Design a protein around this ligand. Structure first.
Ligand code: XGB
Ligand code: CL
Lengths: 9, 267
C-alpha cells in the first residue's frame, strides 16, 4: 500500500 | 548582517512551509536550519509574519517546540533561523523506514507531542498542522520537536472558518461545514497521528473516509490503544477527549523518559 506525504500551506 | 552570521549548507526540503537549508552559526558553530518564506505567500501577519509571532510566543527552554533563534526581513521574503538537532529525522521518514511503531515507542512519542501541544496552547498558540511531517526526532536525546507553525493561529475560543493545514489530518466538521474549534480539531489530528504511529500510515485519504466515522485497524493494535484512537476520532467534536483525558487514559500510563526512549529504540 502506498504511503505519501500531503501538502499544507 | 545575514550572510555573514551563518554558513549555508544543503537544502533540507521545500514545500508549503518555504525552503529550508542546513546551516551553521559562524560565531559558535551552532547547527541551525535556515527557513525562507516568500512574502507573497504569507497570508496572516502580526506585531511580521504570524509564523514569527507564534514561534516567539512558544520560545523557551522547553524542548518540545522548535526554537526560533533569530529572523531577518528581505525585500521579497522573511528568513527564520531555527535550532537544528543533530542527528535528526522527521517522524514521517522515521515511520516510513520503521513501519508501524511498537506501542511503547508510540506511547513515548505521543506523550511528548501532547506535552508540546499543551505548551503551545498554554502560550496562546494553535498549531493547526500537527502531523508526522511536522515533528522532528532528536535521535540522541529521544526528544520530539514540533515544527512548521506557518499554518497556525492565535488560540481563541470562538469558531475558526479558515484553514490551510493538511486536509487528511483535518476534522470532519471542517470537511462538512468549514467550521471548527481549536482544541477539538487539534485532538482529531492527534488521533490521526496516533493511528499513523501504531499502524504505519494514516487511516483516511478521502473526504468520505474522514466524515464516515469508521476506523479500521490494519495492524495488530491493543484494545486500550484502539479505544484512545477512536475517542480522539469521535465524529462529534464535543465527544472527543480533553488533553487531560488523553494523558490520563490507561494506554498512556508508565511512559518512558526521553533518554530511555533513545537508548531502547533509537540508538
Ligand atoms: N520545515 C522545517 N522546519 C525545520 C526546522 C528545523 C529543521 Br533541522 C528542519 C526543518 N524543516
Ligand atoms: Cl520550523
Amino acid at each position: 500500500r502506498k504511503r505519501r506525504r500531503h501538502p499544507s500551506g | 548582517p545575514l550572510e555573514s552570521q551563518y554558513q549555508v549548507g544543503p537544502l533540507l526540503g521545500s514545500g508549503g512551509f518555504g525552503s529550508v537549508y542546513s546551516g551553521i552559526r559562524v560565531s559558535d558553530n551552532l547547527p541551525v536550519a535556515i527557513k525562507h518564506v516568500e512574502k507573497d505567500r504569507i497570508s496572516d501577519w502580526g506585531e511580521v509574519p504570524m509564523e514569527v509571532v507564534l514561534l516567539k510566543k512558544v520560545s523557551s527552554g522547553f524542548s518540545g517546540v522548535i526554537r526560533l533563534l533569530d529572523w531577518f526581513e528581505r525585500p521579497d521574503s522573511f528568513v527564520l533561523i531555527l535550532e537544528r538537532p543533530e542527528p535528526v529525522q522527521d517522524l514521517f521518514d522515521f515511520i516510513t523506514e520503521r513501519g508501524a511503531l511498537q506501542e511503547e515507542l508510540a506511547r513515548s512519542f505521543f506523550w511528548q507531542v501532547l506535552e508540546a501541544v499543551r505548551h503551545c496552547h498554554n502560550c496562546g498558540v494553535l498549531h493547526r498542522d500537527i502531523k508526522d511531517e511536522n515533528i522532528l526526532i532528536d535521535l540522541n536525546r529521544g526528544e520530539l520537536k514540533l515544527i512548521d507553525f506557518g499554518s497556525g493561529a492565535l488560540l481563541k475560543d470562538t469558531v475558526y472558518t479558515d484553514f490551510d493545514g493538511t486536509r487528511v489530518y483535518s476534522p470532519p466538521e471542517w470537511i462538512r461545514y468549514h467550521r471548527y474549534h481549536g482544541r477539538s480539531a487539534a485532538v482529531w489530528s492527534l488521533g490521526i497521528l496516533l493511528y499513523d504511529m501504531v499502524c504505519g500510515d494514516i487511516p483516511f485519504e478521502h473526504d468520505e473516509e474522514i466524515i464516515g466515522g469508521q476506523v479500521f485497524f490494519r495492524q495488530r493494535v491493543s484494545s486500550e490503544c484502539q479505544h484512545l484512537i477512536r475517542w480522539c476520532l469521535a465524529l462529534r467534536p464535543s465527544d472527543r477527549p480533553t488533553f487531560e483525558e488523553i494523558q490520563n487514559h490507561p494506554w498512556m500510563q508508565d511512559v518512558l523518559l526521553p533518554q530511555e526512549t533513545a537508548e531502547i529504540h533509537l540508538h
